Design an enzyme around this catalytic site. Structure first.
Site, PDB file in Angstrom:
ATOM      1  N   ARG B  89       0.821  -1.203   0.000  1.00  0.00           N
ATOM      2  CA  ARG B  89       0.000   0.000   0.000  1.00  0.00           C
ATOM      3  C   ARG B  89       0.855   1.253   0.000  1.00  0.00           C
ATOM      4  NH1 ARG B  89      -3.734  -2.587   3.046  1.00  0.00           N
ATOM      5  NH2 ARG B  89      -5.036  -3.941   1.742  1.00  0.00           N
ATOM      6  N   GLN B 172     -13.592   7.111  17.223  1.00  0.00           N
ATOM      7  CA  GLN B 172     -13.885   8.528  17.273  1.00  0.00           C
ATOM      8  C   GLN B 172     -12.932   9.227  18.193  1.00  0.00           C
ATOM      9  OE1 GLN B 172     -17.138  11.841  18.620  1.00  0.00           O
ATOM     10  NE2 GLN B 172     -17.330   9.664  19.267  1.00  0.00           N
ATOM     11  N   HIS B 176      -9.456  11.342  16.486  1.00  0.00           N
ATOM     12  CA  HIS B 176      -9.626  12.756  16.798  1.00  0.00           C
ATOM     13  C   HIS B 176      -8.411  13.496  17.367  1.00  0.00           C
ATOM     14  CE1 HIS B 176     -13.389  12.201  15.029  1.00  0.00           C
ATOM     15  NE2 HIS B 176     -14.020  13.209  15.605  1.00  0.00           N
ATOM     16  N   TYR B 324      -9.988  -9.981   8.047  1.00  0.00           N
ATOM     17  CA  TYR B 324      -8.966 -10.830   7.473  1.00  0.00           C
ATOM     18  C   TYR B 324      -8.789 -12.025   8.373  1.00  0.00           C
ATOM     19  CZ  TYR B 324      -7.373  -7.272   4.182  1.00  0.00           C
ATOM     20  OH  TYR B 324      -7.313  -6.345   3.172  1.00  0.00           O
ATOM     21  N   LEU B 353     -13.104  10.401   4.253  1.00  0.00           N
ATOM     22  CA  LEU B 353     -13.568   9.013   4.264  1.00  0.00           C
ATOM     23  C   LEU B 353     -13.814   8.474   5.662  1.00  0.00           C
ATOM     24  CD1 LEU B 353     -11.178   6.880   5.191  1.00  0.00           C
ATOM     25  CD2 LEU B 353     -10.271   7.534   2.941  1.00  0.00           C
ATOM     26  N   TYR B 354     -13.133   9.062   6.644  1.00  0.00           N
ATOM     27  CA  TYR B 354     -13.286   8.622   8.025  1.00  0.00           C
ATOM     28  C   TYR B 354     -14.502   9.203   8.734  1.00  0.00           C
ATOM     29  CZ  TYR B 354      -9.939   5.484  10.575  1.00  0.00           C
ATOM     30  OH  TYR B 354      -9.200   4.478  11.151  1.00  0.00           O
ATOM     31  N   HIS B 357     -20.105   8.330  10.541  1.00  0.00           N
ATOM     32  CA  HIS B 357     -21.273   8.595  11.358  1.00  0.00           C
ATOM     33  C   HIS B 357     -22.255   7.402  11.312  1.00  0.00           C
ATOM     34  CE1 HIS B 357     -19.822  12.885  11.388  1.00  0.00           C
ATOM     35  NE2 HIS B 357     -19.755  12.435  12.617  1.00  0.00           N
ATOM     36  N   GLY B 495      -8.320   4.570   2.195  1.00  0.00           N
ATOM     37  CA  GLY B 495      -7.947   4.592   3.595  1.00  0.00           C
ATOM     38  C   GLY B 495      -6.886   3.655   4.155  1.00  0.00           C
ATOM     39  N   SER B 499      -4.004   4.875   6.466  1.00  0.00           N
ATOM     40  CA  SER B 499      -3.964   4.316   7.822  1.00  0.00           C
ATOM     41  C   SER B 499      -2.630   3.690   8.256  1.00  0.00           C
ATOM     42  CB  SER B 499      -5.120   3.316   8.041  1.00  0.00           C
ATOM     43  OG  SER B 499      -5.500   3.180   9.410  1.00  0.00           O
TER      44      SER B 499
HETATM   45  C1  HEM Z   1     -20.753  10.850  19.416  1.00  0.00           C
HETATM   46  C2  HEM Z   1     -21.586  11.303  18.328  1.00  0.00           C
HETATM   47  C3  HEM Z   1     -21.055  12.055  17.306  1.00  0.00           C
HETATM   48  C4  HEM Z   1     -21.393  13.327  17.039  1.00  0.00           C
HETATM   49  C5  HEM Z   1     -22.569  14.086  17.649  1.00  0.00           C
HETATM   50  C6  HEM Z   1     -20.504  13.776  15.988  1.00  0.00           C
HETATM   51  C7  HEM Z   1     -20.438  15.074  15.541  1.00  0.00           C
HETATM   52  C8  HEM Z   1     -19.520  15.553  14.632  1.00  0.00           C
HETATM   53  C9  HEM Z   1     -19.416  16.942  14.230  1.00  0.00           C
HETATM   54  C10 HEM Z   1     -20.327  18.079  14.664  1.00  0.00           C
HETATM   55  C11 HEM Z   1     -18.344  17.041  13.416  1.00  0.00           C
HETATM   56  C12 HEM Z   1     -17.801  18.313  12.766  1.00  0.00           C
HETATM   57  C13 HEM Z   1     -18.692  18.844  11.635  1.00  0.00           C
HETATM   58  C14 HEM Z   1     -17.940  19.053  10.311  1.00  0.00           C
HETATM   59  O1  HEM Z   1     -17.596  18.050   9.639  1.00  0.00           O
HETATM   60  O2  HEM Z   1     -17.700  20.227   9.933  1.00  0.00           O
HETATM   61  C15 HEM Z   1     -17.809  15.701  13.310  1.00  0.00           C
HETATM   62  C16 HEM Z   1     -16.716  15.377  12.566  1.00  0.00           C
HETATM   63  C17 HEM Z   1     -16.212  14.110  12.405  1.00  0.00           C
HETATM   64  N1  HEM Z   1     -16.773  12.976  12.940  1.00  0.00           N
HETATM   65 FE1  HEM Z   1     -18.268  12.871  14.190  1.00  0.00          FE
HETATM   66  N2  HEM Z   1     -19.662  12.767  15.572  1.00  0.00           N
HETATM   67  C18 HEM Z   1     -20.006  11.693  16.367  1.00  0.00           C
HETATM   68  C19 HEM Z   1     -19.490  10.428  16.219  1.00  0.00           C
HETATM   69  C20 HEM Z   1     -18.552  10.059  15.279  1.00  0.00           C
HETATM   70  C21 HEM Z   1     -18.021   8.717  15.124  1.00  0.00           C
HETATM   71  C22 HEM Z   1     -18.324   7.501  15.970  1.00  0.00           C
HETATM   72  C23 HEM Z   1     -17.129   8.761  14.111  1.00  0.00           C
HETATM   73  C24 HEM Z   1     -16.482   7.668  13.559  1.00  0.00           C
HETATM   74  C25 HEM Z   1     -15.056   7.587  13.445  1.00  0.00           C
HETATM   75  C26 HEM Z   1     -17.074  10.142  13.672  1.00  0.00           C
HETATM   76  C27 HEM Z   1     -16.138  10.634  12.787  1.00  0.00           C
HETATM   77  C28 HEM Z   1     -15.971  11.960  12.465  1.00  0.00           C
HETATM   78  C29 HEM Z   1     -14.888  12.479  11.639  1.00  0.00           C
HETATM   79  C30 HEM Z   1     -13.795  11.723  10.917  1.00  0.00           C
HETATM   80  C31 HEM Z   1     -15.023  13.810  11.630  1.00  0.00           C
HETATM   81  C32 HEM Z   1     -14.028  14.818  11.084  1.00  0.00           C
HETATM   82  C33 HEM Z   1     -12.961  15.254  12.115  1.00  0.00           C
HETATM   83  C34 HEM Z   1     -12.380  16.641  11.814  1.00  0.00           C
HETATM   84  O3  HEM Z   1     -12.246  17.026  10.625  1.00  0.00           O
HETATM   85  O4  HEM Z   1     -12.079  17.368  12.775  1.00  0.00           O
HETATM   86  N3  HEM Z   1     -17.969  10.932  14.376  1.00  0.00           N
HETATM   87  N4  HEM Z   1     -18.535  14.795  14.044  1.00  0.00           N
HETATM   88  N1  LIG Z   2     -13.815  -5.869   5.843  1.00  0.00           N
HETATM   89  S1  LIG Z   2     -13.405  -4.613   4.705  1.00  0.00           S
HETATM   90  O1  LIG Z   2     -13.363  -5.127   3.383  1.00  0.00           O
HETATM   91  O2  LIG Z   2     -14.344  -3.530   4.816  1.00  0.00           O
HETATM   92  C1  LIG Z   2     -11.723  -4.021   5.126  1.00  0.00           C
HETATM   93  C2  LIG Z   2     -10.631  -4.667   4.540  1.00  0.00           C
HETATM   94  C3  LIG Z   2      -9.350  -4.221   4.791  1.00  0.00           C
HETATM   95  C4  LIG Z   2      -9.139  -3.126   5.637  1.00  0.00           C
HETATM   96  N2  LIG Z   2      -7.793  -2.755   5.910  1.00  0.00           N
HETATM   97  N3  LIG Z   2      -6.671  -3.694   5.864  1.00  0.00           N
HETATM   98  C5  LIG Z   2      -5.643  -3.118   6.405  1.00  0.00           C
HETATM   99  C6  LIG Z   2      -4.320  -3.739   6.656  1.00  0.00           C
HETATM  100  F1  LIG Z   2      -4.468  -4.990   7.080  1.00  0.00           F
HETATM  101  F2  LIG Z   2      -3.597  -3.726   5.539  1.00  0.00           F
HETATM  102  F3  LIG Z   2      -3.729  -3.044   7.602  1.00  0.00           F
HETATM  103  C7  LIG Z   2      -6.048  -1.758   6.805  1.00  0.00           C
HETATM  104  C8  LIG Z   2      -7.338  -1.601   6.481  1.00  0.00           C
HETATM  105  C9  LIG Z   2      -8.093  -0.343   6.676  1.00  0.00           C
HETATM  106  C10 LIG Z   2      -8.033   0.299   7.914  1.00  0.00           C
HETATM  107  C11 LIG Z   2      -8.599   1.573   8.060  1.00  0.00           C
HETATM  108  C12 LIG Z   2      -9.232   2.185   6.985  1.00  0.00           C
HETATM  109 BR1  LIG Z   2      -9.895   3.873   7.176  1.00  0.00          BR
HETATM  110  C13 LIG Z   2      -9.326   1.552   5.758  1.00  0.00           C
HETATM  111  C14 LIG Z   2      -8.751   0.273   5.594  1.00  0.00           C
HETATM  112  C15 LIG Z   2     -10.230  -2.461   6.232  1.00  0.00           C
HETATM  113  C16 LIG Z   2     -11.523  -2.910   5.979  1.00  0.00           C
END
Ligand code: HEM
Ligand SMILES: NS(=O)(=O)c1ccc(-n2nc(C(F)(F)F)cc2-c2ccc(Br)cc2)cc1
Ligand code: HEM
Ligand SMILES: NS(=O)(=O)c1ccc(-n2nc(C(F)(F)F)cc2-c2ccc(Br)cc2)cc1
Ligand SMILES: *[C@@H]1O[C@H](CO)[C@@H](O)[C@H](O)[C@H]1NC(C)=O
Ligand SMILES: *[C@@H]1O[C@H](CO)[C@@H](O)[C@H](O)[C@H]1NC(C)=O
Ligand SMILES: *[C@@H]1O[C@H](CO)[C@@H](O)[C@H](O)[C@H]1NC(C)=O
Ligand SMILES: *[C@@H]1O[C@H](CO)[C@@H](O)[C@H](O)[C@H]1NC(C)=O
Ligand SMILES: *[C@@H]1O[C@H](CO)[C@@H](O)[C@H](O)[C@H]1NC(C)=O
Ligand SMILES: *[C@@H]1O[C@H](CO)[C@@H](O)[C@H](O)[C@H]1NC(C)=O
Lengths: 552, 552
Positions: B89, B172, B176, B324, B353-354, B357, B495, B499
């Site tokens: 990768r 999360q 973060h 896997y 991509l992360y 929600h 991703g 990652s």
């Molecule tokens: C606990 C409930 C959750 C709430 C209420 C919430 C709320 C939010 C809010 C308000 C934002 C920023 C809005 C924007 O994109 O401009 C955000 C960003 C994000 N959330 Fe959530 N979220 C929650 C759970 C999760 C979960 C479980 C994930 C899964 C990994 C997630 C991943 C993300 C990601 C990747 C971002 C962007 C981070 C950044 O750019 O700072 N969220 N979320």
């Molecule tokens: N069951 S699945 O097809 O959805 C699936 C298959 C493979 C992966 N994979 N494999 C690896 C590794 F083993 F190479 F590390 C990392 C990730 C990975 C981790 C974080 C993100 Br963000 C994206 C990919 C994840 C999901």
């Protein structure tokens, strides 16, 4: 108190206390096992009696001029020679960086904080009995005593390599982009967060400044024209702060970028040269990309200059300073199939060894004149009066000092040299010898061996007593010069590894940056691959004055 | 206007205007030549008809459990398998980083400025006819229309992989530390200058904060004890700013480190767990180095936790999330004899991509209770009431959503999901397809192929028209799930490269950091090599609640 104060781990093992009065060494990947990482593994033995010495190699490089004039012509052979030179030293530097002024142990803070200069060898436990750990006395030789006795110059000693003023001033202007000690914070701190060849000395440490210096037209750098010649803008036009004493004319306060380059006409000479080069390439680009806007012209140009800078420093500068017969080469493509970290952090030890004040003459003769430091320092006139032409001419013609001789530091610069001795002391450095073993060099057994004479040797022994307490800085300015050369073995062996990393480990030398595209076409790329200290002058100095870093 | 708007350079060539209405591609080291870097060199041909697809490989990984249960036991074989997964990768990410929000061309500013998220594919020329360059209409589908039609959840869709809440909340909390968008500056900016796994979410972005959170005794982190349990200190004790609405009790305002983790009991749960781990290791160190002072105990511990974090994220997290059969391994020593950059810059595309929600449930059932988002968000009580024990239990038992299904975004979080759609739009992103080819995936030929069904497929076509205009974000939440898995092919292929880089490319994984010494002895090293999401809980949660990122 701390058990590792005795610096007991050999061959690069790491040392940690294990209980107040006990330690343990980490010979991980040293190649040596046992209590202090001394007894080598078979393979280590095998290569050790095979490893030719830096000296028993430096001979080869400087000699057989005939052979070299064969290799130097077989492109196949040349790059092959250069790839090795490029690679071999690399194993001596840590990437990512490790210790720092305040961390004799790894820590995240050490690694994270870009405000610190890195450190090739940890400090001395602030709780060690003596200044070098355990060896020597409660105190270390009066620096003033040491300064005068062996460092201060009596009769000017020329450089056996012919290093002119073009060289001496180039190195001071160049290295002053990365060496920029944050004296407010202390020795150990730097304001050069770019930790490398980023031409910040030209463009600004910050975007704020960089914009203050910018034309914002054609991608050009701001500038003024005094008597039909192009000089930096004023500290009143642009609003960029500079260091100029109050008794300095408005039109005299040049802007430039590095806040200190205004205090020495040597600096401002090169400043005005690069400031012209930027603009030049800007033109070479505009009518190659008539459709480009300001920013790209700027940002592209800044990229090409970083290329030139590196090409010169490797092909002219280093070439000269080494006296090698083999023709060094700047070719990012040689490290491609190689492991290598395209990142860099500047170490204190590199800053230190680079205090080549000895290079400085007693007077600055700009042919048909002679200036005392007192009158060269921060003077508008001298440059404005002689101009870049009769300055390039006046300087190509003017030999510089000799660093690794002994007693060659100009008295003027004496304050500095002392500071260097008593600052490295501040930053709890280690012995000249610990730094030597650190870089694969054998420890000196007598000051006499160190100097290769005895007048000074016997004097140093008066001061230090144990050779294993000789300080690194002084030693560099004293040490027996390699043959008809300017430096000693140490000066060459610590600094080369440092020098090539910060040169090669620059983003623009990474496979995804090194391509016609990164620079605006094949054109701006060639500008990088055809650069030379000569071309730089020919192109941006009035009549093409011939030039060299060598006194002809 | 700009000729490269049509994104004409294939196979990764670079494109630059050459005269208003003309461009040129840089196939340097692509493996393809010709006008658009399409006709491959022989060797490219040779390897192409040999390259098994990510799918025609994902099969292998998930299948033949018997075979894997053989490889998985031949340490020789295992590490051999993992080295490849680790390496393959890697060729997809640029190191050093290249483009950014404002630079579709390389520039030094792009490279220098740590305030920007990097960018796997340049933006779209702000002067291009359509939002994706040339393809599509003056405008792009009403995001709200798109949100509702294909993103918003109707009936809760569980995750076919069994990912519980322990997983959803962990990700999360973890991600973060690196994803921290500087909303004051804009989309594209980050406040996570550490660009990676630095546990800043735990210790502080700045030394100032880090110190406010510190005990400065035994190397421990500051803390409070409510009802005999250890919770973070208060925003009044320590003086560290946090995000808490005014209607929040003094004792409720937890400090922790990441300024936002107080708004969700899931976060603060893990916050309190790590805050306990730090202190824990601090003890494991103090009586292993009774002679250590505060700082080293601190700094060492922070080093060990960054080890654990990585060991878990690779051996539990990723393992699960991948389904896997092969047993992933965290072994810095596998990349040693390999080319690799021990550095990392986080891209927008990785942040985007992360945005999982969908993982979020409709209610937060802490067994014998059920909360609406409205009441889970920034609540002191829930954690204080149930405690870490009956929270770990209540969450191991609770399935999470499915990301790559379709219509699964909780309505609550609907505001967010929309933003994501119309922010990536702000940061002039490129088509789902350009990102696909960018990561070696074949472009989708119909929305129907994308989703692998037609109800949504036909709706998307209503909105986009050209599949080569389907946006990246939505597509990720829609796309046909890989078999009985949570993600689509894109979501996995973009991703994974991202990652593993931010995991492996961390200083502590570099040969000079990866050793018993860096962490205080063999002890704290084993702490890193025996870590698991289970041990983390067993050790720092009241009775050892069993746990898994899988719903059992
Ligand atoms: C606990 C409930 C959750 C709430 C209420 C919430 C709320 C939010 C809010 C308000 C934002 C920023 C809005 C924007 O994109 O401009 C955000 C960003 C994000 N959330 Fe959530 N979220 C929650 C759970 C999760 C979960 C479980 C994930 C899964 C990994 C997630 C991943 C993300 C990601 C990747 C971002 C962007 C981070 C950044 O750019 O700072 N969220 N979320
Ligand atoms: N069951 S699945 O097809 O959805 C699936 C298959 C493979 C992966 N994979 N494999 C690896 C590794 F083993 F190479 F590390 C990392 C990730 C990975 C981790 C974080 C993100 Br963000 C994206 C990919 C994840 C999901
Ligand atoms: C033009 C005459 C020169 C003068 C008057 C001069 C003066 C000084 C002074 C006052 C300092 C800072 C004092 C300190 O260390 O605390 C300094 C530092 C330094 N000088 Fe010079 N110098 C001159 C030429 C040179 C030359 C030609 C070199 C050779 C490369 C050189 C290399 C250095 C280095 C490496 C430092 C440390 C830079 C830093 O840490 O910021 N100097 N010099
Ligand atoms: N004539 S000499 O013995 O004094 C001498 C011999 C070799 C070198 N040398 N060779 C190289 C390279 F060619 F490998 F690049 C780099 C340096 C170098 C550059 C900067 C510093 Br700082 C230290 C060393 C320098 C002086
Ligand atoms: C190891 O080094 C220490 C300190 O330098 C010394 O006391 C000891 O004798 C050495 N032991 C061996 C086996 O080298
Ligand atoms: C680096 O360390 C110095 C002194 O320890 C501190 O003042 C400075 O704020 C640190 N830099 C950062 C970015 O934390
Ligand atoms: C400035 O340079 C001029 C011209 O070379 C010289 O005569 C004069 O002494 C210098 N001025 C000062 C104040 O040193
Ligand atoms: C290259 O792509 C451009 C723009 O997409 C197109 O005009 C040209 O015909 C293509 N040529 C080849 C050889 O693919
Ligand atoms: C990064 O770039 C933005 C916009 O170009 C600028 O405002 C910011 O100051 C830069 N960050 C740094 C540290 O220079
Ligand atoms: C906080 O949590 C408690 C306990 O779960 C809950 O009963 C209450 O509704 C919440 N308080 C507020 C103000 O939402």
């Amino acid at each position: 108190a701390n058990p590792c104060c005795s610096n007991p781990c050999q061959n690069r093992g790491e040392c940690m206390s294990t209980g107040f009065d006990q330690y343990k060494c980490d010979c991980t990947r040293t190649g040596f096992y046992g209590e202090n990482c001394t007894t080598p593994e078979f393979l280590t033995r095998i290569k050790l009696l095979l490893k030719p010495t830096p000296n028993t190699v430096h001979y080869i490089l400087t000699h057989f001029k005939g052979v070299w004039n064969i290799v130097n012509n077989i492109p196949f052979l040349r790059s092959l020679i250069m790839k090795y030179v490029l690679t071999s030293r690399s194993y001596l530097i840590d990437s990512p960086p490790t210790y720092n002024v305040h961390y004799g142990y790894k820590s995240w803070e050490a690694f994270s904080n870009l405000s610190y200069y890195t450190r090739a060898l940890p400090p001395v436990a602030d709780d060690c009995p003596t200044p070098m750990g355990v060896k020597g006395n409660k105190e270390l030789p009066d620096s003033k005593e040491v300064l005068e006795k062996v460092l201060l110059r009596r009769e000017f000693i020329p450089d056996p390599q012919g290093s002119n003023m073009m060289f001496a001033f180039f190195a001071q202007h160049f290295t002053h982009q990365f060496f920029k000690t944050d004296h407010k914070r202390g020795p150990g701190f730097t304001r050069g967060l770019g930790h490398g060849v980023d031409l910040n000395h030209i463009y600004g440490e910050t975007l704020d400044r960089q914009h203050k210096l910018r034309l914002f037209k054609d991608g050009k750098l701001k500038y003024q024209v005094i008597g039909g010649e192009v000089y930096p803008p004023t500290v009143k036009d642009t609003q960029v702060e500079m260091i100029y004493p109050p008794h300095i004319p408005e039109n005299l306060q040049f802007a430039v970028g590095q806040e200190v380059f205004g205090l020495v006409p040597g600096l401002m000479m090169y400043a005005t040269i690069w400031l012209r080069e930027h603009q030049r390439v800007c033109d070479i680009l505009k009518q190659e990309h008539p459709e480009w806007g300001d920013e790209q012209l700027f940002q592209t140009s800044k990229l090409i200059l970083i290329g030139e800078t590196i090409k010169i420093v490797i092909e002219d500068y280093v070439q000269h300073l080494s006296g090698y017969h083999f023709k060094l080469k700047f070719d990012p493509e040689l490290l491609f199939n190689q492991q290598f970290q395209y990142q860099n952090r500047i170490a204190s030890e590199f800053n230190t060894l680079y205090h080549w004040h000895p290079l400085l003459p007693d007077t600055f003769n700009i042919e048909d004149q002679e200036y005392s430091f007192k009158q060269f320092l921060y003077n508008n006139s001298i440059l404005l009066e002689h101009g870049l032409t009769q300055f390039v001419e006046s300087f190509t013609r003017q030999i510089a000092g000799r660093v690794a001789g002994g007693r060659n530091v100009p008295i003027a610069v004496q304050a500095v040299a002392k500071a260097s001795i008593d600052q490295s002391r501040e930053m709890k450095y280690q012995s000249l010898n610990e730094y030597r073993k650190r870089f694969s060099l054998k420890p000196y057994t007598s000051f006499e061996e160190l100097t290769g004479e005895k007048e000074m040797a016997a004097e140093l022994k008066a001061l230090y007593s144990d050779i294993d307490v000789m300080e690194l800085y002084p030693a560099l300015l004293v040490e027996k010069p390699r043959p008809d050369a300017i430096f000693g073995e140490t000066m060459v062996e610590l600094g080369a590894p440092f020098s090539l990393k910060g040169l090669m480990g620059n983003p623009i030398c990474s496979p995804q940056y090194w391509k016609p595209s990164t620079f605006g076409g094949e054109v701006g790329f060639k500008i990088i691959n055809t650069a030379s200290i000569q071309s730089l002058i020919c192109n941006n100095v009035k009549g093409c004055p011939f030039t060299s870093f060598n006194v002809q």
